[PDB]
Amino acid sequence: TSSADLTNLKELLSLYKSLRFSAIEKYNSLVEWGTSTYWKIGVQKTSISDYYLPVYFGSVFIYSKGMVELGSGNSFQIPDEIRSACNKVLDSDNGIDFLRFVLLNNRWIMEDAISQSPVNIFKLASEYGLNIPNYLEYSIMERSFDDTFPKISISYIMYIESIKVDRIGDNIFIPSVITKGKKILVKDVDHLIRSKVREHTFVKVKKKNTFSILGEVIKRIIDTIGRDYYVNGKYFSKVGIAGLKQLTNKLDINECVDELVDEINKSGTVKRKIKNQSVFDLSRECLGYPEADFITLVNNMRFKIENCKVVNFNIENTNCLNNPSIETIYGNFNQFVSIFNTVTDVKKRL
Amino acid sequence: GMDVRCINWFESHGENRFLYLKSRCRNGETVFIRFPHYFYYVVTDEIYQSLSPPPFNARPMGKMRTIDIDETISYNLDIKDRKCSVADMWLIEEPKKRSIQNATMDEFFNISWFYISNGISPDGCYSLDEQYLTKINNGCYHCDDPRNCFAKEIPRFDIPRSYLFLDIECHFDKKFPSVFINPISHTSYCYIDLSGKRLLFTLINEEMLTEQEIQEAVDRGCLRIQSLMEMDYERELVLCSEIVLLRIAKQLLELTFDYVVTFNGHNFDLRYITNRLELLTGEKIIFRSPDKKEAVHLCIYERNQSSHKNTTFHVNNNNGTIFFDLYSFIQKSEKLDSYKLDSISKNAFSCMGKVLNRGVREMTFIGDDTTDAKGKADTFAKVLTTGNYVTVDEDIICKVIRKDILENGFKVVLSCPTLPNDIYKLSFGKDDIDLAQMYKDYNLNIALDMARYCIHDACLCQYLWEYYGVETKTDAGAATYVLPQSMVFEYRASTIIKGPLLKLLLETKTILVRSETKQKFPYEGGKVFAPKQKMFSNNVLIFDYNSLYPNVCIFGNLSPETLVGVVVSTNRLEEEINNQLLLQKYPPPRYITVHCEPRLPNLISEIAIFDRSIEGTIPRLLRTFLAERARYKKMLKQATSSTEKAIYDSMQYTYKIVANSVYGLMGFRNSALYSYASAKSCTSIGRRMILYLESVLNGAELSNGMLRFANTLSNPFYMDDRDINPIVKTSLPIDYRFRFRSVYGDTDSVFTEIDSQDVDKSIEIAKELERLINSRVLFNNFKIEFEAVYKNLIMQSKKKYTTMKYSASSNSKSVPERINKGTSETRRDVSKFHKNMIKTYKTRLSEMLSEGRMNSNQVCIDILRSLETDLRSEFDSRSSPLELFMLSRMHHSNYKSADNPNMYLVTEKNNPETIELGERYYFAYNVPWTKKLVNIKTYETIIDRSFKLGSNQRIFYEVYFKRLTSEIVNLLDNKVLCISFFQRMFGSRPTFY
Amino acid sequence: ISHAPITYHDDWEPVMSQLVEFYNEVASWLLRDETSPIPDKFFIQLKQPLRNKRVCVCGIDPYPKDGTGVPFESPNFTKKSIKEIASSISRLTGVIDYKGYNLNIIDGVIPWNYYLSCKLGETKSHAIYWDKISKLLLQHITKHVSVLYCLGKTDFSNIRAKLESPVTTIVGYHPAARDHQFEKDRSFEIINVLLELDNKTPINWAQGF
DNA sequence: TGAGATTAAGTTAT
DNA sequence: TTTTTTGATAACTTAATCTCA
Ligand SMILES: [Ca+2]
Ligand SMILES: [Ca+2]
Ligand SMILES: [Ca+2]
16 A cells, blocks of 8 residues: 555565574564455465585574574574674675574584575675685595584584593583594584483494484483583583672673672673673573573572572472473572672672 | 524535534424534644645644553563653644644544534534524525534424335345336335324335226225325325336435434335436436535445454435434344344234133234233334234234224234133234235235235334334434434444544543554453352352443553553563562552563563553543443433433433443554553453452351351452451341352352242342442442342353342242343254243252252153153154244354355355345254264255245254253263163263263 | 347356346346447456456446546546556656556456446446446456455445455555545555565566557 | 364354 | 544354274
8 A cells, every 4th residue: 555565565575485594473463464454465374495515513503684593493692792793694795595603612603605606605704704614615525624623514516431521611511422532522412312322332423534423311311421510501511609700701801899890880881781681681691501491490489589689499399300400400509599699789789 | 593403414525525514493494504624633833834835724722742652561670651742732624635744633534523623512402693604505504613603502402303214115026126127016104294294105106006996096085196296295095106106205305304214224225216216217316415516316335344353334415314224223232133124023012912802713802001011002002003913922923803092002803713811912023924925916905905014114114213212322322422413323332432532632632642563462361160060949149240341441540541561570580579679669559550461471470550640541431431321321210201212211321332342442453442451451350350259259158147258358459448357247137047159250240059949038138248248348439239039040051051030129929030141041042942841841950959859860751751742743844933943143254165064054046035144044954763963954054034844854853852951961960861862863972061 | 148139258157147147137227328338348358268367457437438448448648547557657667668558468467347337427326237246247356366456445445345255455546536645655566566475476567568 | 982182163141 | 526444352062083994
């Protein structure tokens, strides 16, 4: 009818095609408007489009709108808004589709992207310098090219002995198992969770160039791997008893009662971050507790919060204790409540 | 024109647009007034001061306050205050449509703007000042400003209203009559001119009658006019031609009638007359404008109203006449299956008659205040003045051989075949007349009989007009809705509130600009409570709230401008903190906090806050509606003349209707009163109120002379100012020992079962319980009333139940009524020989279980004996009563291939006779003792609706027997023969939930 | 046919059988009186299947005495309605070839007339002569179409009643209007993208001239 | 070898 | 030949679905 309706229909058409990369929630409401004004429309109310350069081994995600995973609906947060810091390659340079970022040991890397031609994608990668997949424009071709991170292949255009967990970052411990003296690429816990491998047992694992790769089981995993090594997502994490050190490390500020407040006030960006997010969310991010498990644990509890401070937490439903991750997290809940109290006091003082 | 009373309002859709006014003086003359009409805009001083034309006309509207009403989720306690702008918006009139940038105070069409800018009640009488009035034509007095011309208003007066109750009888050869091939036969008019001179006309078309018949009629005292000018208005029968009849019809219609009334008229009658007139003569009904400037060439337009989760035909004349149709109005009020002329007459005209004399066929009846209460006898006599067919005992219809109305009743002499007893039910039901066969062989005697039938049809339209009080209804609608009289029965609840809402806004000087993307969440939660058990056999007391939803809407001030914020939480580590913040920052008796169900799935708690400081638009609109209904319903208790029903009887009904839809409008998305949080809070508080009432009467003991309520008496929302003592000081007789158990509760109704069985004790107990509940249980404006004593309560389902209604007046020996709330009896789904059997079985079980045995099982054996008498014998079709087998099933619209998948429903063939979307339908679907179950819904379609069926057939039978047995086994408990009930015939086992 | 003596096509097969019966009731009187279109613009737009004209335009006024049958077909450009449509098309695109704009010669667009015949200077008057035929005639178009172009605004308000099946349709302001409220915003390209929403090729309104 | 759980929707009642 | 449309849900009812085959 009017220009607004034309714009609405154009954007409906635009988001209809780019639905597997999510917008999809608002897409249903878009169909609702169309089914009324025109009495019907041509449409009805989480993986890469088929399409398809070595694979940067890790956790792969795709983003095109402005980060969902092809394997499942895994859209998590990003450090310091890297996606917006890189502007929008999709909008600025049309032709590329579902730009792919791979995370490897808390380091974000970009793998090969599908366009047009790969030349413009490589030029954009050079312009916005994060990393490069390779320069092709399993022990040959890709073996000649060297990099600090493992790479195997997209295209070109054994016996274990014991268990030893590694360490990457702050309270982050990637899984690792030693074979008959190499580390098996089992950094993804779910693959280890879905396939529990007993130690000192032959396992069907294949090595291409550098390394090899393939509730009751979760109890065995939590008991064997250092006891107090819970699941914080794709990796493991220890209890990590700490006070202001973790708060300073996460906020990227100098270690410091009034000293911390003065340090926060000195940096405007950190002050905005503090007064731009809820206390619970930032505390959970600082301690690295998984969002899914911690929400369930909190919902299944009977806190006695007074004056925005937890006094004596307790558990009510024992069923949630079936998951070993919640058991370990509930064990270190005192650290979380202390850090939450400290954060609330700091924000009240500010 | 000195003092003249307004009759209709309208406007001219010409090159220059004028808003007219038709009025009647104290004499019998029509006075027309004309005014200029403009589009109205209330933009601010900064949008119209900068435009190509200067202000053509402006008014000092005043400093208007605009509040932005919006709802936004807040995962915190930081809520920004509502932005209010006080400015100097000017009331601007422009004779042409301009697209202004501001566009404030929208969603008002054109007319309420005029009515409130100037100030006019669309129904009423005014002293039209001659200072401004100019004789622009013959009788049309046009003046410029409609503002000071109506400075003084006076009480209304009984004008000599003019009525044209017209009904035409056509040739129904085999299908529905059409304007192209079916000639008109028997146009009848109940012409009531401006002299109190009722004139009944039954003009027969002479192209069908022969010379002998018309000569005999003339000898009997009839006419054979050949021109329009020679017709006599004082006669009672005419034998005119088709073209002359159409010319007479055009002359009558073009006249400045106050009302032209029909039944199925706009769709059929008036359209038929018009289309026939232009088809035969070539003349067109030119409704001259009041100032004689615009010719309309009458054409009836169709208006469609459909709900996302109805076609009405209307007149387009612009001369002040209020052309009306009764079919559409009838299919708008209450809820009943009577949607046909004969059915409505049967349901409306009834009385009791005593057989004072018998005979071979003549059974004289008598009707007066002795047999019936009052009024119905007089109405029966009035219909009998032209009626000649009366239905007795619901199945016998006899032609009235002789009639005589002496002073207050009738002396009808029927053709009954020596009926037994002494007292019978005399009602104007349908007639044994076969219209198609009557028109098949058309002779003089049949012509006179059809003339009697058609004049009775016109007078019956008049009698339905008087019974429904349609003129009162139209006047009340005009007065309430601030609308022209021609538009009172074609606007739904969304637009009918705009007038009063606009008046309220202009009195309060608020615009309430609504920004885009306010709310989109689906709906609010609800709950239904199951009863305790399926058998009571004791007295059950019914308590009902007084318009609970409007009452809570005014209690909580649930308005979008009073909405502060919806604080929502996703976990419990923050829910406690923000809950404490809400409790400590918002004092209770200025902000109401409602724990509505969370709007988003990932939320566990949602609290909506409403500011009860300044009254909102909804709590003031419905308050005004309630006050108006209360004030306009007490006048009928004081008025003794015809005004008691002529004026002061439909105002309260219309105000009740408008108050009973405010809550529904408050949740409707694109409405002027939409507020999602308000609907959520209203529903939540209603559920809290029903829970509070139920769990205070669940186990209340009437020990000695006091009642101990179940739980404490505390306000379910905040800390009110009521006592919490559950014991009361009721004044029942001290020798009482009863226990109350709260069994069932609907939105505003609560049932409590009692140990007693006699009616009088239950009535007194319930009355004093009701008088104690409002004093102690309820608070503020929440009032309750005792409906009736429901003994023999049987909760057939969660909501469906059958009882024996006993009001606060019907004590013991008073004849009871089986008033129910959704059981088989009230629901239309049931059919013939289904309600009587279950009625008898339930009545037997009443005294079977009142004494108390818990082991008597003879009910099943007695039911088997009663059913086996006719269960096998009914298998012969024997002309089964099709007239009462079906249900409220209409020609449905939403379907894929067939609604309720079947053979030819919705899709269907030969269904001409009154078949369309929205019409209640009656129809029917050598192998006796049918075997197995074959999903018995075989022949379900929409075909020609008749009242006859074949015979000598052994067709299978429907859910009658199975449902009777299912209800019976729901009443009882033993399933010893449950399989054997239908294993031989169908094969199944009752659910017995 | 009894009045004005069909050559039914395979496309309009389930329509003509009831169409003749509906027509015969009116043809006894409408045909006798003179009408603005020639007594031929009744079944001319029936030949050939309608399996590719997925955009159908309908109008209620079959022009004054200089009628043409299908709407917007007069090769004179003097028509007020045709001139404004062509001006809007030129504004949107900018084609200089002017030989008479018409919405009929398109590989995927068919023009339709709401009322097949109307009298000289008598618009909106034939709300009863063609009322029954119109519903059945529009039913077949509704059965298979992508979008329907209705112009007339409140003139075409009563269209859901004649809409037997749910389809995509748009009701636009007529070129006459009241304050020339047609060139301000028409949003024609919506239909040009509507076919895209139904996985159908968009139609540029410049094919054939 | 009868016992159940949404459809497929309506279907009446505050 | 010109301004105009409509209240959300909660549930009992019959429906075959079909295979144990
Ligand atoms: Ca009639
Ligand atoms: Ca009639
Ligand atoms: Ca009530």
